[PDB]
C-alpha cells in the first residue's frame, strides 16, 4: 500500500509535495540541506543558472539522486523536503530562505527533465486561437523577433518568420510574468500577456509551500512532545631623494608599478584629479615606495593642474591622532566599493574587461585571463610580474621589481 501510494504520488519525476509521507530522518534532512545551502551560496555569488546547474549535478548523484526508478531515492526526496518543513517553519526569515532555495531547486530539476516528462508533470495556461494569433500577428512577431534571434540563433528573417508561423502563444494575466514584462519579452494587450510556463509553476509552488510552512508551524507545538527536537534545532541552526615628485612620473620608476598604480597615474594625468578612494590608494602606495611628505604635497599640487593639504599630511601620520597609516594590500584595495565611471581605484584584473586587459598585456595572456576568470586577481598580477620581468601587495610588487635591478 505504501509502494502504491508512492507510485501514485510520483507518476512524475517531480512533485509539489502535496500529501504528507506515509538515522534516515537526520541523514536525509542533512543531504537535502547541503544541496539547498550550495544553491544559496551560488545565488549569493550571482552565478548564472547554467553554472549553478553544472555545480549541483554531481551533488545530486551523491546526496539526492533525481531521475531514478529507485523507490528509496524517491522516498529520500519526499521525506527530506517534509523534514526541512519542520526545521524551517519556525521564523519568517527561515521560511523565506527555505521557500527561495526550494523553489530554485524545483526550477533546476524541471529544466533537467525531458520535454516529455515536463509535459506529463504539467498534465498531472490557455493557448490562443489561430484567429486571435492572426489578428495580433504583427505585434506578436515584433515582440518575439529579438528573442528568436538571440535565444534560438535564427539570424535570417525568413527562418524567424517560418518558426513564428508554427509557434503557439499562451494568454495569461500579466502579473504571472512580471519578469518578462520588465524586459519587454512578452506582448501585452488588455491586462493579458502573450507568452514562461516554468515561472508560473515556480510561483504557484512557492505560494503553496509558504502556506504549508505556516500550517506546519501552527501544528508544531503538538510535536514538541516527541527524539526530533534536538535534530530540528540543530538543522535550523546549521543554516547559521631618488623617489621624488618628478621621478614618480618617469619610465625608470613607473616601469616598476603594478597595473592598479599605472591606472591611477593615468587617471590622474588625464583628469588632473583623483576621487577619494583613488587618492588614498595612490597616496599610501607612494608613501610606501619612499615619497617624502614634502615631495608628496608637491606631487599632488602639481598634478591638480583648504580641502586637500591636511588629508595628504594626515596620510603620513602628521595630523590628528598621528597614525602612520599602512599602505593598502590587494585584499584591502579589493574590499573598497567597486569603481564606477570616473573612478581609478580598485584592481584592473577584476575591474577591466578581458578586451581591455588583453590590449594592455599585448598563451601568456590566456593564462592571466584564466586566473582573472577564477577571481584569483593576485595570481593574475603575479603572473604579469613574472612574465614582464605570490605577490598580494602593490608595494611588494614595486619593491620586488626594484630588487631585480639592484
Amino acid at each position: 500500500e505504501e509502494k502504491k501510494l508512492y507510485a501514485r504520488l510520483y507518476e512524475s519525476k517531480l512533485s509539489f509535495y502535496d500529501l504528507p509521507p506515509q538515522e534516515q530522518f537526520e541523514i536525509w534532512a542533512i543531504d537535502r540541506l547541503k544541496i539547498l545551502l550550495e544553491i544559496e551560496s551560488c545565488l549569493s555569488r550571482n552565478k548564472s543558472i547554467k553554472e549553478i546547474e553544472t555545480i549541483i549535478k554531481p551533488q545530486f548523484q551523491k546526496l539526492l539522486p533525481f531521475n531514478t526508478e529507485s523507490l528509496e531515492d524517491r522516498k529520500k526526496d519526499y521525506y527530506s523536503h517534509f523534514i526541512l518543513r519542520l526545521c524551517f517553519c519556525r521564523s519568517k526569515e527561515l521560511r523565506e530562505k527555505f521557500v527561495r532555495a526550494e523553489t530554485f531547486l524545483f526550477k533546476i530539476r524541471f529544466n533537467m527533465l525531458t520535454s516529455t516528462d515536463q509535459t506529463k508533470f504539467v498534465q498531472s495556461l490557455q493557448f490562443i486561437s489561430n484567429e486571435e494569433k492572426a489578428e495580433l500577428s504583427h505585434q506578436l512577431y515584433q515582440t518575439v523577433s529579438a528573442s528568436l534571434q538571440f535565444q534560438l540563433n535564427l539570424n535570417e528573417e525568413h527562418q524567424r518568420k517560418q518558426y513564428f508561423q508554427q509557434e503557439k502563444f499562451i494568454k495569461l494575466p500579466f502579473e504571472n510574468v512580471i519578469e518578462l514584462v520588465g524586459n519587454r519579452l512578452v506582448f501585452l494587450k488588455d491586462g493579458y500577456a502573450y507568452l514562461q510556463q516554468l515561472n508560473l509553476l515556480s510561483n504557484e509552488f512557492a505560494s503553496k509551500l509558504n502556506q504549508e510552512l505556516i500550517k506546519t508551524y501552527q501544528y508544531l507545538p503538538r510535536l514538541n512532545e516527541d527524539r526530533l527536537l534536538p535534530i530540528l534545532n540543530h538543522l535550523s541552526s546549521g543554516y547559521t631623494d631618488e623617489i621624488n615628485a618628478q621621478s614618480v612620473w618617469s619610465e625608470e620608476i613607473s616601469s616598476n608599478y603594478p597595473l592598479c598604480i599605472k591606472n591611477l597615474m593615468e587617471g590622474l594625468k588625464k583628469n588632473h584629479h583623483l576621487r577619494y578612494y583613488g587618492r588614498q590608494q595612490l597616496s599610501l602606495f607612494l608613501k610606501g615606495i619612499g615619497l617624502s611628505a614634502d615631495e608628496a604635497l608637491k606631487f599632488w599640487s602639481e598634478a591638480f593642474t583648504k580641502e586637500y593639504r591636511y588629508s595628504f599630511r594626515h596620510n603620513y601620520g602628521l595630523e590628528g591622532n598621528r597614525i602612520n597609516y599602512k599602505p593598502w594590500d590587494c585584499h584591502t584595495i579589493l574590499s573598497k566599493p567597486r569603481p564606477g565611471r570616473g573612478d581609478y581605484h580598485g584592481c584592473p584584473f577584476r575591474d577591466w574587461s578581458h578586451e581591455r586587459l588583453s590590449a594592455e598585456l599585448r598563451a601568456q595572456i590566456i593564462s592571466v585571463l584564466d586566473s582573472c576568470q577564477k577571481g584569483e586577481y593576485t595570481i593574475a598580477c603575479t603572473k604579469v610580474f613574472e612574465m614582464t620581468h605570490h605577490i598580494a601587495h602593490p608595494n611588494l610588487y614595486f619593491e620586488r621589481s626594484r630588487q631585480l635591478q639592484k
Binding site: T143, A146, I178, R184, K189
Partner: protein, 339 residues
C-alpha cells in the same frame, strides 16, 4: 493664498464628499477610508503623516481644523493609521524634463504651447494603461503648476505589489536616461508599445518641435541636444561645420540638412545601413523630445504619498483640478477668483 483663504476654501469649496466617495470605493464608509493614510503639509514646513478619517464629516472637520497648505493620499492599511502610536497606481509627469526642448517658457513658467508635452505624455500613457494593461478607471489631475498626476483606481491596479508596480513603470518608462547630451540608442526592433508610441508622436514632431518650439534655431543648443542624437562622428563634424558657416538655420532646415549631408557622405553598397541607422536616430530623437518622462519614485511603492485632487498650489493659487482633452493650465481656477 493666505491662511484665511485656505480656511475659506476648505469650509465652502473643497469637494470632501466626492473625494471621500472616490477613496472609499463604496457609498457606505469602509476600511478603504478608515485605514487610509493621509499626510498634511503645513505653512510652517511641518509635515504630519498617518492621519485617517472615518466619515465625510470627520474628514472635513479635521482638514478645516488643521488648515494644511495641502494634503497627500497614501495606502489603505490593515489598521487605522491614526492609531499608529499604539493604493491607487499613480504616475507623475512634470515639465522639468522637457525644459531642454521648449523656448515658449523659461524656468517655472508654463503655457498652452509647452502644455502639449504633458498632453502627449497623458495620451501615450493612457494608450498603454487602456490597451496593454486593460485599465478602465483612471483620471488625470493638474498638479497646480506645470505637471499632471494620473490616478488608476481599477481594483487590479489598487492591489498591485511594489514588484508589479515597478514592472508597470519599467514598461511605460522608455526614456530611462534623461541626459540630452547622449544618443538614447534604443533597443531594435522596437517593442510594440514603443513602435505604436512613435507612430502616435510622429504627426506632432514637426508642428511642436520644428515649428512652435524651434529649439535648434540656436546653433549652440543644436550642438548640445540635436547633434548628440546622431550616431556618426563624420556626419556630426560636417553638420557642425556647415551650421558654423551658415548660422541660425531653423530647426526645420537643420532637420533637413541632416539628411542632405548624410546622403552626400554615405555612398556605395553600405549606404542603406547608414540610411536605416540615421532613421533610427531620428526616431529615437522623436521619442527623446515627446515621449512621457515620468517621475519614477511615486509609482514604485504602494506606500508613496501623492497630493490630493482639488488641493491648492501654494505658489500659484491654482486648484489641482481633473483634466479633460480640452485642458490647459490657464483654465485651472485660482482660489482668489473663486472667492
Amino acid at each position: 493664498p493666505s491662511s484665511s483663504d485656505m480656511e475659506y476654501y476648505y469650509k465652502s469649496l473643497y469637494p470632501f464628499k466626492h473625494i471621500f466617495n472616490w477613496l472609499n470605493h463604496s457609498p457606505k464608509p469602509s476600511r478603504d477610508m478608515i485605514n487610509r493614510e493621509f499626510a498634511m503639509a503645513f505653512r510652517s514646513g511641518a509635515y504630519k503623516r498617518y492621519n485617517s478619517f472615518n466619515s465625510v464629516q470627520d474628514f472635513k472637520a479635521q482638514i478645516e481644523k488643521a488648515n494644511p497648505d495641502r494634503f497627500e493620499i497614501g495606502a489603505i492599511y490593515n489598521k487605522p493609521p491614526r492609531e499608529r502610536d499604539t493604493k491607487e497606481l499613480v504616475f507623475d509627469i512634470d515639465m522639468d524634463d522637457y525644459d531642454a526642448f521648449r523656448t515658449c517658457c523659461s524656468g517655472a513658467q508654463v503655457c498652452s504651447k509647452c502644455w502639449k508635452f504633458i498632453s502627449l505624455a497623458m495620451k501615450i500613457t493612457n494608450t498603454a494603461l487602456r490597451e496593454d494593461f486593460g485599465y478602465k478607471d483612471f483620471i488625470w489631475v493638474f498638479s497646480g503648476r506645470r505637471g499632471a498626476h494620473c490616478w488608476v483606481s481599477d481594483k487590479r491596479a489598487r492591489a498591485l505589489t511594489d514588484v508589479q508596480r515597478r514592472n508597470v513603470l519599467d514598461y511605460v518608462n522608455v526614456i530611462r536616461d534623461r541626459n540630452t547630451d547622449k544618443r538614447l540608442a534604443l533597443k531594435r526592433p522596437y517593442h510594440p508599445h514603443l513602435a505604436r508610441s512613435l507612430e502616435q508622436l510622429k504627426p506632432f514632431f514637426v508642428s511642436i518641435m520644428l515649428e512652435e518650439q524651434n529649439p535648434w534655431e540656436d546653433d549652440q543648443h543644436a550642438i548640445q541636444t540635436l547633434l548628440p542624437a546622431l550616431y556618426d562622428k563624420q556626419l556630426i563634424d560636417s553638420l557642425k561645420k556647415y551650421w558654423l558657416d551658415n548660422p541660425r538655420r531653423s530647426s526645420k532646415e537643420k532637420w533637413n540638412d541632416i539628411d542632405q549631408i548624410a546622403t552626400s557622405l554615405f555612398k556605395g553598397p553600405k549606404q542603406d545601413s547608414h540610411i536605416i541607422k540615421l532613421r533610427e536616430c531620428k526616431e529615437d530623437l522623436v521619442l527623446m523630445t515627446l515621449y512621457p518622462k515620468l517621475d519614477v519614485e511615486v509609482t514604485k511603492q504602494t506606500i508613496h504619498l501623492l497630493k490630493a485632487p482639488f488641493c491648492i498650489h501654494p505658489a500659484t493659487g491654482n486648484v489641482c483640478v481633473p483634466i479633460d482633452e480640452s485642458f490647459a493650465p490657464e483654465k485651472a481656477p485660482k482660489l482668489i477668483d473663486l472667492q
